[PDB]
Amino acid sequence: VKQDMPPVGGYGPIDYKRNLPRRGLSGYSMFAVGIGALLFGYWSMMRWNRERRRLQIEDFEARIALMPLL
Amino acid sequence: KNFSLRIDELEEMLTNNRIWRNRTVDIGVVTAEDALNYGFSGVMLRGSGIQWDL
């Protein structure tokens, strides 16, 4: 006879339990990365703001030199 | 064989989500006496700690 039957060795194991990976860095790592990015941005903004102040002083002194003719 | 991965995907997408959690922390709380006296059956009873399954 022929009928719907599982095979001679049966069917294989089937996973039925939860599997969460558990991934990412430790919280100290992202805190250190954020703090380092903050410090780098602070340093770059400091340098560029000082340069901008120097350029503004230069432009203002050019204006002061140009004033009497106007 | 391939459905348990979908179950794990759904359980990652909803169970650990904070927005999904904060909608259901202490909403619709029921007690065992009011579970049995109101004719509840199934998951509701198993929601309240009552150990019963047909």
Partners of A20 on chain B (C-beta within 8 Å) are 8, 11-12
CB contact under 8 A, A15 and B4: yes
SS3 content of chain B, % helix, strand, coil (to 5): 50, 0, 50
Separation of alpha carbons B45 and A15, rounded Å: 28
Specify burial of residue B12 (Cβ count, 10 A radius: 0-12, 13-18, 19+).
Answer: middle
Residues whose CB is less than 8 angstroms from the CB of residue A17 and which lie 6 or more positions away in sequence, other chains included: none
Separation of alpha carbons A21 and A18, rounded Å: 10
Tokens 């619709």 -> residue: B28
- The type of residue at B4 is S
CB contact under 8 A, A14 and B8: no
Separation of alpha carbons B16 and B22, rounded Å: 11
Residue A13 per-residue DSSP state: P
**To probe the interface with B, which of A16, A17, A19 has the most B CB atoms within 10 Å?**
A19
Q: What sign does the dihedral B28-B14-B21-A18 (CA atoms) show?
A: positive
Separation of alpha carbons B8 and B2, rounded Å: 11
- CA neighbor of B11 nearest in space, from A25, A16, A14, A27: A16
Neighbours of B35 (CB within 10 A): 19
Angstrom resolution of this structure: 3.8
Give the chain B residue nearest A16 (alpha carbons).
B4
Separation of alpha carbons B15 and A20, rounded Å: 11
Using DSSP, state whether B41 is helix, strand or coil: coil
